[PDB]
Amino acid sequence: NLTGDIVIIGAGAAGSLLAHYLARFSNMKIILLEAGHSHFNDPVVTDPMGFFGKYNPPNENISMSQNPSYSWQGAQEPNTGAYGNRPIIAHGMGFGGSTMINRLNLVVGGRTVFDNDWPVGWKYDDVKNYFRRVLVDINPVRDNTKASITSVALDALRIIAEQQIASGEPVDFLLNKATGNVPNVEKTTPDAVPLNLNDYEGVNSVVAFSSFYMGVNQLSDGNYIRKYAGNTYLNRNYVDENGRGIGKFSGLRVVSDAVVDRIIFKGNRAVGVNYIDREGIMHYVKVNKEVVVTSGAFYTPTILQRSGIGDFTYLSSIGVKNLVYNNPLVGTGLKNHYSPVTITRVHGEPSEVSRFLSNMAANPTNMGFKGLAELGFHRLDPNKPANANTVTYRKYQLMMTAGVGIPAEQQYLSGLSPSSNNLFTLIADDIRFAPEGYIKIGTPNIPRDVPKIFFNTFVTYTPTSAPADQQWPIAQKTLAPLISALLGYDIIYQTLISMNQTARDSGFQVSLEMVYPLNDLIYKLHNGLATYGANWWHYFVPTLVGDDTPAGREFADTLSKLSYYPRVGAHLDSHQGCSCSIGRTVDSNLKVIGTQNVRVADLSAAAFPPGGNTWATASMIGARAVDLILGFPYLRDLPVNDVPILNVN
Amino acid sequence: NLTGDIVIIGAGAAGSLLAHYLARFSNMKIILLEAGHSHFNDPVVTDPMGFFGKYNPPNENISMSQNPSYSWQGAQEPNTGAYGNRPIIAHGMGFGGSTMINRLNLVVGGRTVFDNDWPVGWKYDDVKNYFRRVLVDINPVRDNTKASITSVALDALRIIAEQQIASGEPVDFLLNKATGNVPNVEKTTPDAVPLNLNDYEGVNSVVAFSSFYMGVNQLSDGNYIRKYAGNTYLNRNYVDENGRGIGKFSGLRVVSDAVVDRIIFKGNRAVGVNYIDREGIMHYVKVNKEVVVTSGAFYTPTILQRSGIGDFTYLSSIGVKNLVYNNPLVGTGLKNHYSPVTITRVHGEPSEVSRFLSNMAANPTNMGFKGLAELGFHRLDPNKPANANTVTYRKYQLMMTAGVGIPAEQQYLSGLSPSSNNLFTLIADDIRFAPEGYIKIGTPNIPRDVPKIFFNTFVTYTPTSAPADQQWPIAQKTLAPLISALLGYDIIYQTLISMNQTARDSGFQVSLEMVYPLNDLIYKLHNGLATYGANWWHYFVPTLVGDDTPAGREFADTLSKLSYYPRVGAHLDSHQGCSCSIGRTVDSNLKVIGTQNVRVADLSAAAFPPGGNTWATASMIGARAVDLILGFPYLRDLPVNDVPILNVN
Amino acid sequence: NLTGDIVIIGAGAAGSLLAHYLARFSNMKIILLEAGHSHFNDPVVTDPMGFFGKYNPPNENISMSQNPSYSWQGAQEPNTGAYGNRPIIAHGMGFGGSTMINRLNLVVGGRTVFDNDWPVGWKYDDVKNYFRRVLVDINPVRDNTKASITSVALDALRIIAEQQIASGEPVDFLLNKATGNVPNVEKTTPDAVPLNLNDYEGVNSVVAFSSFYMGVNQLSDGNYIRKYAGNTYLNRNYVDENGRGIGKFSGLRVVSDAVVDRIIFKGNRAVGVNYIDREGIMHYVKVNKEVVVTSGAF
Ligand SMILES: Cc1cc2nc3c(=O)[nH]c(=O)nc-3n(C[C@H](O)[C@H](O)[C@H](O)COP(=O)(O)OP(=O)(O)OC[C@H]3O[C@@H](n4cnc5c(N)ncnc54)[C@H](O)[C@@H]3O)c2cc1C
Ligand SMILES: Cc1cc2nc3c(=O)[nH]c(=O)nc-3n(C[C@H](O)[C@H](O)[C@H](O)COP(=O)(O)OP(=O)(O)OC[C@H]3O[C@@H](n4cnc5c(N)ncnc54)[C@H](O)[C@@H]3O)c2cc1C
Ligand SMILES: Cc1cc2nc3c(=O)[nH]c(=O)nc-3n(C[C@H](O)[C@H](O)[C@H](O)COP(=O)(O)OP(=O)(O)OC[C@H]3O[C@@H](n4cnc5c(N)ncnc54)[C@H](O)[C@@H]3O)c2cc1C
């Protein structure tokens, strides 16, 4: 009963697309099991303002990500590098996966991030068509309400970019080699050409723009809707309430509220998978040809290990009765970003400061994401690729936001009350984040929301009684995240001083200065950078360098004092992935090593995170997997003018 | 397949006692459920000192209650009173349940709690026999190693109590009505017998002692061992490897790797239970007579909601098929305590302060804490019952530990070194916490670590359009935790200010100061308390009092800033319970209201949180359930000299 | 009752390997009797620091070798050549034999020690594969923390070795003939090639190195474990708590806490062996084809 040539686990960001383009482009019987259910008529999801809690009950006013009925609750172990706290990250449960609860921003990643870090047969020129297909299928829209702050910021970054171009340094964070001598920045003219950060040819690596492309749409009424995988690939036009396909998709048979705990094996090939229905009773599903797993970043290692594939020593220590294959790499090598935050306050006359921040309110067409640029490398960064003098990378993503987005305790401590209406927010984050972790299960019975999740982000360095030059490379490798965070702070400071001069030039007689990071510290950091140079981070370890000069010890105190911001004055970005990268757990065909008929086709099978937000990465993976499993480039050849018909239901 | 006359859910503290004492007096089939595995040869759990991290790997040094392979990770919903933090409370996963991961501390809770806060048939004069049986079964041992600060604290508190009892105040925190106006402090003379806090007749409610009691056990070699509930009642001296007992224990069988799904009903009566093993095969165990669900104060309500007992509307919306009985109050009123930490500094010459703080190291007979007393409510607290003037209660719990117990971020912000010996922690645990919460399920497919659990601790008040005379009771009732915490702060300050002169008299030429809570602020708190008398609490809200005196503004600011510390400079102890309290889901005979033959014997059935640790209360509930289901009072009159026996192998 | 084609006495350093590779590579019924029992979940054994007494009770702080519950107590006669004293030597009792209480160091022996002193059919070229099999099965690991003293010592021995080579004497203690004129000493360079004293071809007879190969391993947690015969050849994957093999090793039936005092004979062939169980009562074991004894040196 309930057989299937291809069995798909989870209707995540790639599961829905895989099921759709697999049922349509073939004639086999396909069955999909998803833990969540459709939310097509849920006002909290469809309305973009539901992210801010416009439909919450009065006595249960919690966020959608913190609701265990919408997402997995992945509580993590205490963090040695984050002052011994236990933050909780979530994965959206339901059709579309984590695209039901995100902030609806799309980035493609770039050209170099796929050209260098990815293995052969996987570069940008092979996934360009899949990326374009995904983007046109989503069909995003830019921001509609334009503000005066954005033009001033654009001209400021333009001035900084032209100064850096005239400088002659090898690489900086406003240098786009593929463009040329002309700075890669948008124009402040009201009739400027809208510059895109997702160009089809990948010519824009680091560049300043005016807006991103939200995953929203405007309806005939005037209401805005949320566009994501669920309402783009698996609407009512294809699957009914009985979970059956119609038309040429009749081979698909999707089952909702179905979580699968284990894949049954015959020793080296899969024969069936079992799930538990809403009755609380178990069920059996028989697999014919292959098994597809789309369980997301944090939870494909668990389903792989619990099913019998993984480190046999630790699995035996846990108590796994049935063992299949032994790799010491299952679940290791996952990556995630981190977003330090800064707050800038404007001082002046009330009218001028009220007019300066015009057109900033949270709107469904932007969700507060005005955005500035995807910045690159710092001039003082020690940890840079060897071939940096040949290509330009992506390291930072500068985005502007209204209000003061900071944890409440830090808001009270710093005094930045949201009642103040003369301040805004800009965020610089790291997309090539260094620190790494691991996931291990604790019980081989059922997939639980809390496995052993060790993630230490900003660790320190303990000097030893060894020669300094012998140990310095180790310290440089270890202290990368703090270096990146402080370089981001310096970049924000340069952008801010350019903002001040440009705003004074543009007729607004106001001044913008940093207040949140205790500007004394930031100004001292800038002075120390200028007076020291490439060896600025040597004083991160005070007794190792042993300068013992008042300037040197004061800089050591400043560096130790400023390390608290990157650790506590931010919130962790939920872009985890790449826990089963190609070569570690799967080959270049996304098939498991040593196994015969199991395939994994989500973000968990990514070699390295992209140079941007990873919405399109998962779907793209699925798209590629569609033609890898079918055997012909059916999906990649389809013309650009073919999008699934969007049904609101 | 299996058959069982009486089924007990959860091999925990009360569950194991229930199972052993039920198979002891009869020969009917008994089945005990437990999903983990054996831990009889694990040094971390067998050795009592392994609780503090004796054998933890250096790379993964975490507490045993923070390890997913040892316990469930029941993260709760954000707390609106502490900047939205989500503390995580754990339930043990193994033989003995939560008795495998605790401190083994034994406290009864006095007699007034069961004199006024428990229903008829649950009074102290009826449960004292069960409490004594539990205490003599555990067989604790008193502390042996002695420091030289306990006598100083006892003498200072003796002076304070003498002054207070001679003052003639109506009620205070150092007066006991069951002994007399003579102060009840342990004599510092070396020829004084100790006054235990667990007297069989409950003579002492507020009592000053020297140490606590702990459920460790002694070996022939000299090594100390842990004899937990699953080790005292379910060890190999009574039950074999396979499960079949011999002789009078032949009616007991324990299952392994069994995690339940739901109890199948036949309309109103329990007919069977089910669970899933490692392989993933469900086994139907039919129940003949009764089902006792005592799987914990966090997951018994969960399995009851899956059973179909709770809110019909919510269960129907979520997707629960079978509805058995509707009870809106199921899993409501969850109760737990709270404890803020503080740091005291010692001043003087290094040698004298070093010898002053000597012999203060954790061992299997102190568990780090020294312990002083358990005081009552203060002289200015407006939150008291009517019976306060006729009988004393147990409101606060004071302990002293070595080192510093304080969050690492708080350590950095306060700038107090952990390596320094001269700082010790003076914590005032509150055992009469005001607020309560409830529990709901998220997804009816499989058991999950994180259900919906709500708990708000520091709910602040906001002015509303109403006269102050008709508003003040609301502010009084809303702000109870803050008043209790600040009065505890004042109690600790008084204790230390007396202990200064007491230590000066004792010989040590030292001075002790209250550093971490900003002694300036605590001194201001004491001065304002003494100045404003019974009307001080009106100043928490500055707009309502309507006094524009600069001293009033200063006092209001001092009250406001001092509220920050209890949110972050504290920790929420894992003594949660009272979710299915007597009179809401169960009645005096523990039969669940609505069903036929179902009973709850966990800690969630407590009618009120006792003034202390909660293992003894749960063991008492299980012991009472033994005789309630047996029908004859065998355990109520069992001789004290008849005790179980333990076997290591 | 309790018959067996091959009867093995004691699960010593060779008994466990013999039982494993005999039950797996044949189809006869094999039964093993061992005086000790498994210590797979004993922190004193698994933890390498248990050798220094990190888990001893306060009132019984004695070494693991001096504990009669872990090893035989072979007290010796007074020594005329050692000033009339009676030192006591021990043999580890249990799975793996004396490998439960040793200091976890592995040496192969060399080429000449087997080439000269051993009889025909037993030289190094006949036992090379067995030695390599044993070494790869144990899979030892070198030292991880390097010290400054070792480099200074290495260069000192290098200077002494080159002086002795230039001397021209017949044989000395830094002269490796199989190497040549270049001294057989490791290099003090931080990026030196790790020289091995257990080379597969036996080219290193006398040579200076940087570390041996401990019988330990590093776990995913970070904890170190003791690697020896018991946890290398007779784990839970092959024998259960009932002492029965599983899979292709089902012919094996091991009995723990079984000491055999005598082998019964029919005049020139063995017919059975008898042991005493933990009850303190005797038992009879019948031998079918041969008897194997692995009771150790003493
Ligand atoms: C607050 C927030 C904001 C974000 N903003 C952005 C943004 O602006 N831009 C961006 O690019 N990304 C953003 N993200 C991240 C983005 O939502 C996802 O990380 C991205 O879709 C990649 O993850 P995924 O979809 O592959 O994982 P998912 O597909 O979401 O992984 C979980 C899925 O697997 C299924 N599943 C898992 N285990 C099982 C099982 N055992 N049985 C059955 N089904 C199972 C679940 O049902 C679910 O469908 C944001 C995330 C969060 C939390
Ligand atoms: C960290 C910590 C410290 C503590 N310290 C103290 C102290 O110092 N003093 C004190 O008096 N008390 C202390 N306690 C409390 C003590 O543990 C009490 O026993 C507790 O309050 C009540 O335990 P219980 O009997 O309800 O446990 P139970 O809930 O009965 O034990 C849990 C059992 O239920 C089983 N189980 C749960 N869910 C399922 C399922 N779905 N399927 C199958 N089996 C299941 C588990 O396997 C386990 O065997 C502490 C508790 C904790 C967590
Ligand atoms: C402190 C110490 C450190 C050491 N360090 C090293 C080192 O670094 N390197 C190294 O190579 N060696 C070392 N050794 C020596 C090594 O442990 C052994 O000598 C080596 O394993 C060779 O002995 P064996 O294993 O064959 O003897 P064993 O096999 O240990 O001999 C005793 C075995 O025979 C069994 N047995 C004996 N009589 C009976 C009987 N009547 N009935 C049943 N069973 C019986 C016992 O149960 C036990 O299994 C060390 C020894 C000690 C004591």
Report CA A435 to chain centroid distance, whole Å. Answer: 15
- Bridge partners of A452, per DSSP, are A440
Kindly give the number of the ligand 1 atom that is closest to the alpha carbon of A296. Answer: 31
State in Å: Cα A9 to ligand 1 middle.
Answer: 14
C217 contacts on A by Cβ (under 8 Å): none
Structure tokens at C94: 């249990």
Residue type for position B43: P
Complete DSSP assignment for A7-40: EEE--STTHHHHHHHHHHS--S-EEEE-SS---T
Beta bridge partners of C262: C274
Chain A to chain C, count of Cβ pairs less than 8 Å apart? Answer: 7
Q: Tell me the structure's resolution in angstroms, rounded to a single decimal.
A: 4.0
Q: Give the separation between CA B440 and CA A489, rounded to whole angstroms.
A: 44
Token pair for C52: 């220094």
B449/A446 CB distance under 8 A? no
Percent helix / strand / coil, chain B, rounded to 5? 30, 15, 50
Nearest-CA distance from A225 to chain C in Å? 47
SS3 C252: strand
Query: Which chain A residues have a beta carbon less than 8 Å from that of B88?
Result: 75, 86
Residue among A76, A89, A102 whose CB has most ligand 1 atoms within 8 A, to mutate: A102
Rounded-to-integer distance, Cα B472 and Cα B464, Å: 11
Q: What is the DSSP string of A89-149?
A: EEEE-STTGGGGSS--B-----SHHHHTSS-TT-SHHHHHHHHHHHHHHH--B---S--HH
- Angstroms from A72 CA to nearest CA on chain C: 26
**Beta carbons of B342 and B512 less than 8 angstroms apart:** no
- In the three-class reduction of DSSP (H, G, I as helix; E, B as strand; rest coil), residue A455 is classed as strand
- Residue B60 with chain C: CB contacts under 8 Å: 221-222
Residues 78-97 of A with CB under 8 A from B: 78, 83-86, 88, 93
Q: Look-up: residue for tokens 């990514």?
A: A606
**Residue contact A75–B35, C-beta within 8 A:** no
Which chains would you list as touching B if contact means 3+ CB atom pairs under 8 Å?
A: A, C
Distance CA A381, CA B265 (A): 66
For C105, phi then psi, to 5°, come to: -130, 140
Task: Give the SS3 label for residue B65.
Answer: helix
The length of chain A is 649
- Other Cβ atoms within 10 Å of B453 Cβ, number: 23
Quote the DSSP letter at residue B429. Answer: E
Distance of CA C287 to the CA centre of its chain: 28
Q: Is C220 on the interface with A (CB under 8 A)?
A: yes
Q: Are the C-beta atoms of residues A44 and A66 closer than 8 Å to each other?
A: no
What are phi and psi for residue A154, nearest 5 degrees? -60, -45
Q: Rounded to the nearest 5°, which phi and psi values hold at A102?
A: -80, -175
Q: What is the DSSP secondary-structure string of B225-288?
A: EE--HHHHSSSTTTS-SSS---GGGTTEEE-SS-EEEEEEESSSSEEEEEEE-SS--EEEEEEE
How far is the centre of ligand 2, averaged over its atoms, from the C-alpha of C277 (Å)? 40
Give the amino acid at A432: R
Q: Quote the CA–CA distance of A50 and A46 in Å, as a whole number.
A: 8
DSSP 8-state assignment for residue A571: E
The shares of helix, strand and coil residues in chain A, as percent rounded to the nearest 5, are 30, 15, 50
Give, for A353, the enclosing helix (H) or strand (E): helix A350-356
Ligand nearest to the CA of A73: 1
- Whether C230 lines ligand 3, by a CB cut-off of 6 Å, is no
Q: Whose CA is nearest to atom 7 of ligand 1?
A: A105
Protein residue with least CA distance to atom 51, ligand 2 = B102
Structure tokens of B138? 């555990």
Q: How far is C139 from chain B (nearest CA, A)?
A: 23
Segment 518-577 of chain A within 8 Å of chain B by CB:
564, 568
Residue type, B66: Q
Rounded CA-CA distance A209/A400 in Å is 12
Ligand 3 center from residue C14 Cα (angstroms): 10
User: Per-domain residue ranges for chain B?
Assistant: 1-142+213-336+433-455+574-649, 143-212+337-432+456-573
User: Do B517 and B341 meet the contact criterion of CB atoms below 8 Å apart?
Assistant: no
- A570 close to A488: Cβ distance less than 8 angstroms: no
Annotated binding-site residue? B72: yes
Taking residue C15's Cβ as centre, other Cβ atoms within 10 Å add up to 27
- Asked if C58 lies within 8 A of B222 by C-beta distance, the reply is yes
C260 lines ligand 3 (CB under 6 A): yes
Nearest by CB to B88, from A66, A86, A446: name it. A86
Name, in order, each residue with C-beta under 8 angstroms of C128's C-beta and a sequence gap of 6 or more: C200, C202
Task: Identify whether B538 is a catalytic site residue.
Answer: no
**Residue whose entry in the numeric block shows the structure tokens 């334009």:** A146
**Whole-angstrom distance, CA of residue A32 vs CA of residue A34:** 7
Per the CB < 8 A criterion, the answer to whether C234 and C227 are in contact is no
Pairing of strands C282-293, C216-218: unpaired
Task: State the distance from the centre of ligand 1 to the C-alpha of A98, rounded, in angstroms.
Answer: 3
B221 chain-C contacts, CB cut-off 8 A: 57, 59-60
> What is the Cα–Cα distance from A475 to A540, expressed in whole angstroms?
9
Measured CA to CA, the distance from residue B23 to residue B10 in angstroms comes to: 16
Q: Running DSSP on this structure, what letter comes out for residue A184?
A: -
**CA of residue B99 to ligand 2 center, whole Å:** 6
Method: cryo-EM
- What is the identity of the amino acid at B133? R
Can you point out the beta strands (E) in A329-375? 339-347
With a 6 A CB cut-off, is A93 part of the ligand 1 pocket?
yes
Distance (angstroms) between ligand 2 centre and the Cα of B634 equals 26
Rounded (to 5) percent helix, strand, coil in chain C = 25, 20, 55
Identify whether the C-beta of residue A275 lies closer than 8 Å to the C-beta of residue A287. no
Verify whether ligand 2 is closer than 6 Å to residue B48 (CB atom): no
Kindly report the nearest CA distance between residue B43 and chain C, in angstroms.
Answer: 7
The 3 state secondary structure assigned to A383-402 is CCCHHHHCCCCCCECEEEEC
Q: How far apart are CA A245 and CA A32, in angstroms?
A: 11
Residue A381, ligand 1, Cβ within 6 A: no
Query: Is residue B60 a contact partner of residue A440, using CB atoms and an 8 Å limit?
Result: no
Nearest to A408 among B83, B93, B447 (CB): B83
Nearest CA to ligand 3 atom 40: C259
B352 is in an annotated binding site: no
Residue A34 beta carbon below 6 angstroms from any ligand 1 atom: yes
Q: A282: number of CA atoms within 13 Å, CB side?
A: 19
C34 close to C11: Cβ distance less than 8 angstroms:
yes
Q: Say which of C220, C236, C237 has its CB closest to residue A314.
A: C220
Element (H, E) at B218: strand B216-218
Query: Which residues of A are catalytically annotated?
Result: 575
Q: Where would I find the H helices in chain C?
A: 15-24, 43-46, 112-115, 124-138, 148-167, 230-233
Q: B540 vs chain C: nearest CA distance in angstroms?
A: 50
Nearest residue on chain A to B275, alpha-carbon basis: A281
Q: Which residues of B touch C221 (CB under 8 A)?
A: 57, 59-60
**Residue B107 Cα distances to A230, B207, B610, B616, angstroms:** 55, 13, 9, 6
Distance CA B475, CA B458 (A): 13
